[PDB]
Design a protein around this ligand. Sequence first.
Ligand SMILES: COc1ccc([C@@H]2C(C#N)=C(N)OC3=C2C(=O)C[C@@H](c2cccc4ccccc24)C3)cc1
Ligand SMILES: COc1ccc([C@@H]2C(C#N)=C(N)OC3=C2C(=O)C[C@@H](c2cccc4ccccc24)C3)cc1
Ligand SMILES: COc1ccc([C@@H]2C(C#N)=C(N)OC3=C2C(=O)C[C@@H](c2cccc4ccccc24)C3)cc1
Ligand SMILES: [Ba+2]
Ligand SMILES: [Ba+2]
Ligand SMILES: [Ba+2]
Ligand SMILES: [Ba+2]
Ligand SMILES: [Ba+2]
Ligand SMILES: [Ba+2]
Lengths: 389, 389, 389
Amino acid sequence: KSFLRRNALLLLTVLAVILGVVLGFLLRPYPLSPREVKYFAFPGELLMRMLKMLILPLIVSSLITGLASLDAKASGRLGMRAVVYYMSTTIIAVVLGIILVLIIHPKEVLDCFLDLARNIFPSNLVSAAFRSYSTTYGQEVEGMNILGLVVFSIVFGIALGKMGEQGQLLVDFFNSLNEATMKLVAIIMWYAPLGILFLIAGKIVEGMYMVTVIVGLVIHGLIVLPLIYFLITRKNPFVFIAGILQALITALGTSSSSATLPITFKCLEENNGVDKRITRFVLPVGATINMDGTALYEAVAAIFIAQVIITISITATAASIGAAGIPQAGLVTMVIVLTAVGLPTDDITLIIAVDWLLDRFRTMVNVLGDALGAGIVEHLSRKELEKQD
Amino acid sequence: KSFLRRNALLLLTVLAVILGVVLGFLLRPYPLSPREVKYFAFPGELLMRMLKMLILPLIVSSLITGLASLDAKASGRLGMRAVVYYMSTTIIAVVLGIILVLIIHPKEVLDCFLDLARNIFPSNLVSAAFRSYSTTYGQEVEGMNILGLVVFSIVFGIALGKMGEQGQLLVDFFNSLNEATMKLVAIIMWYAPLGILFLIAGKIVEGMYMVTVIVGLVIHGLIVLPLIYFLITRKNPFVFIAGILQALITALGTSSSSATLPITFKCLEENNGVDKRITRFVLPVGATINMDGTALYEAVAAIFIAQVIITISITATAASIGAAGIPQAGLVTMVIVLTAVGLPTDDITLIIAVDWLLDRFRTMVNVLGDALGAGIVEHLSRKELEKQD
Amino acid sequence: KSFLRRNALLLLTVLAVILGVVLGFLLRPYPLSPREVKYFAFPGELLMRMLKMLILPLIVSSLITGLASLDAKASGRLGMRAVVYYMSTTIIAVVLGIILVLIIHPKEVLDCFLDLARNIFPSNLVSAAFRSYSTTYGQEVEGMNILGLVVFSIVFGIALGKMGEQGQLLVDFFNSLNEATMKLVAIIMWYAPLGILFLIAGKIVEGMYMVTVIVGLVIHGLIVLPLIYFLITRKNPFVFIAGILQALITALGTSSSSATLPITFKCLEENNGVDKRITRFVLPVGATINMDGTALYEAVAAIFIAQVIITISITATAASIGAAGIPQAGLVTMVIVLTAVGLPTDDITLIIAVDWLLDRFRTMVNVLGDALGAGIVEHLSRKELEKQD
Ligand SMILES: COc1ccc([C@@H]2C(C#N)=C(N)OC3=C2C(=O)C[C@@H](c2cccc4ccccc24)C3)cc1
Ligand SMILES: COc1ccc([C@@H]2C(C#N)=C(N)OC3=C2C(=O)C[C@@H](c2cccc4ccccc24)C3)cc1
Ligand SMILES: COc1ccc([C@@H]2C(C#N)=C(N)OC3=C2C(=O)C[C@@H](c2cccc4ccccc24)C3)cc1
Ligand SMILES: [Ba+2]
Ligand SMILES: [Ba+2]
Ligand SMILES: [Ba+2]
Ligand SMILES: [Ba+2]
Ligand SMILES: [Ba+2]
Ligand SMILES: [Ba+2]
């Protein structure tokens, strides 16, 4: 009884996964048009817009204060410590993908590197809050420029840090804004179980590589990542993963690390006891530039098509970073990557009917990586963080 | 002479209605293209963009401070007291509409209830400041999401209230912003007479049901509403209506309660002597969810078409709430409501050439309802308001 | 050696003009498609979006504080003193253009005056941050409404000034914001040489009137304008022009006074020693309503076409003010001005292949005029500025 009292919200999302599959299998025969499916998955659709709402005011207020609270010279130190984690875990994942196809084996290319550089520096900061640049044959398309806003907020935040007295007001303005948006997420946590159960039920009611990706994704998230945690922190990872259980189950239903960022934040500040100044530093960047989960799913999909190496690995990386939160992101990223090799897009019509579940697993590995990444950073922060205290 | 000195701006808008009809009748024969009509009604067109400008920064700053100044638990009490007024006056109006067709008698349906729930929770708060969602066969169309911004500002404002110390800065930021935008409306008041005279003159230069609606709209605004004021407040209503005379004449020319909201605000705070904390609480919501005036005009138009009950009443309600400030709002709302019954849209081509005057009358009944509603709330506020003082 | 140490950034942009023409002439034979030209001028293209980014938060924060710091009654005095400079230098330029075609001689019209009045009062302030109104046969087109934002910020800033105590917080908020965005421009200064050298190199790799315009533009910028400086200030102008050398060379590569505004600001506050309160007052307005450079190039192009007076002068003025920062601004402004006279648009296909260099020269005369204009204002400010101190 005592476990049910405390982990009330946690077990409810566990129950939402069970009852979501149950209701999905209860209404599996579909005599109704996919239009009626959209009207059924509506209580879960509402949950998405509530989270999407809160992304932009959180992701902006988090980085602006996070880099201003931290010393401008020590932030560069901690930054390199965080980048080391990002580049390493990405290298291991792309290496893991090659081994995963060695034993088992079941818009232009240059523009995907030009539009990424173009998105990093936003031409208009308001247009950045809802539009992303992508060269098509206007040029600015729908979906938040989360990369350009993260980049700007990192330099704008650091500029306030180098201002001190005058800059203090703006930092006090964004910290009250970060707390205000985090006080709104307190209610979105309770709508999540009702949402997720109607969200996954509508997504089930609509190929050995499908199992191949899950094999790699679990071996990375349960061996590679926890072993990288135990190596530096010297602390038990399944104690750290236990705290972020509410965030990982939401990622299992959201399929967006950027939309689960508000939950992950409360799953690290409140549950695992991580300093706000370093969750605001690691997590927003990890929700936009992490490749651990996506590159391990994209690259394996880029070798399966060759049946029907250095160049393929770099193109799969700039795919997800070039699509932070764009419409039909997974669909377009796999289309552009096939032009780089030359293989036909006939195989893509098959992956769409199965990506709906695999995109949830890759986000779950990404969310785990951002959380564990923040945890690994904390141990290398202890010298710079005590300096401010 | 002494009356002309004080009520200078008031009598000038009275003179604008007279001179506007006079100039309209002076230039009634139209050998000029409707393109030339648009160039003539330009000094009135400019007035609209000046008001439209100020809607968003007022409607956001009003609710955020209004709900933060008030106690988070007492706001829920006052809210229920306000909702009681909204639901009651709407029920009387829809009942009045049935009696008005008993004696005299001269995009999908489900989507109008899905898009309303979708608009309440905005997917992006910046996209909310200029776009509204509406499923069409992109999906987000032009016109402010005033409902989603009102909803967000009510929960964001209440979150600041539950913050106290940290939240104080943001509330001080929006209250200085509410005063700044209200200091800009001081000048827009003087442009209104020159505007309205060229606005109504261009709108006259371009069916017993036309008189039927005015019969119901005046009997509601002069009997139903003032009697609801005298019943609770026990104060003379035509003394309260006298103060809001500058706001009612602007509504007679604007045809938007949301665009007359900046005038109505100064017509209650300065003219009728109503506490800012409860004008900021009632009026913005009344300008977005009031049905007293619109449902009494929409429902009567929904029975006139049947010649050439419970289901018709609920659909006419979600029409205006689903079109807070959308392009050709009255045109699209009557198109979707005819699909729910089945009657042809042939009759709609006739109502457009006469709605231009009837939309001004419905807004006038709405504006009166929001003002009287705020007045009725004040008497039920006296216990909760003295608590803060 | 000592000159190279101090003027490090200055001589690097001088070197960028040299090496930019050199690299442009090194890669002048073009066997590559204009698509490949766009991929080559990319390190200069990135510089533009970095500046464009910073326009809106600078142009808004500059005017709001600038007019609030200054007395609301004295700002009207200084304003008339600034307007006098704008109207005079524009009259001399349009007169100079008539003399320049006397000795050498080598969407509707009304809508360009209706859309300008429509843009001055923005219908939505968020839509103003990225869209400008222009009647076409939706109605709001891409490109910032810099005029509507300048107009609003001037009245919003003055409203804060007339608020005092309550208004102080918002002014402290925008001044910390002006300093934050100006601390970001410190880095964009160093990217400028690498940018400009790849920006002009890509623009060279793609008619006596071409030389005629440069004759007028230099005689105005080296005689008319410096003589207007020496007449009032009684100080050497080529000492004042020397300080703004980093800003004039950026205008020679940017072709936008609005995008060089962040550099010009640091080129007057730091280099020439001009009071922030009057640079924030003159420069943003000068970057949006100046005609000295553009009207002297547009009007000369409006007489050259007549080969293949009062009405032509007023239409060329409302062209640039109607296109503050719109896509293909110089292309559309010359198209609409030919309809006013009646001459064919066949000559316009020839000016496009040469405007790329002439648009850089007109912006340079505009930037010089805004800087010298601010300098001339300072001497007429000394009484009103010492009053605040
Ligand atoms: C391309 O996507 C990115 C941008 C940033 C980061 C790192 C990060 C994380 N995680 C955060 N929170 O801050 C900084 C980072 C640095 O590497 C460097 C650090 C920094 C310090 C001082 C000056 C800087 C100037 C520009 C950019 C970063 C700067 C801040 C990683 C990837
Ligand atoms: C659908 O459109 C609406 C939204 C709000 C309202 C009411 C209102 C008015 N008028 C204002 N100013 O505040 C609140 C209202 C409540 O009913 C409840 C009240 C409230 C108190 C505490 C927590 C809340 C949480 C969510 C929403 C309202 C809350 C605030 C009416 C219709
Ligand atoms: C059409 O484009 C413009 C708008 C403004 C200006 C002038 C200017 C410059 N430069 C600045 N910084 O402030 C003011 C100006 C005034 O003429 C008048 C002055 C002013 C003082 C008091 C009340 C005002 C009310 C409305 C507008 C300006 C006002 C401010 C020039 C052209
Ligand atoms: Ba990584
Ligand atoms: Ba400090
Ligand atoms: Ba009502
Ligand atoms: Ba308090
Ligand atoms: Ba001028
Ligand atoms: Ba003061």
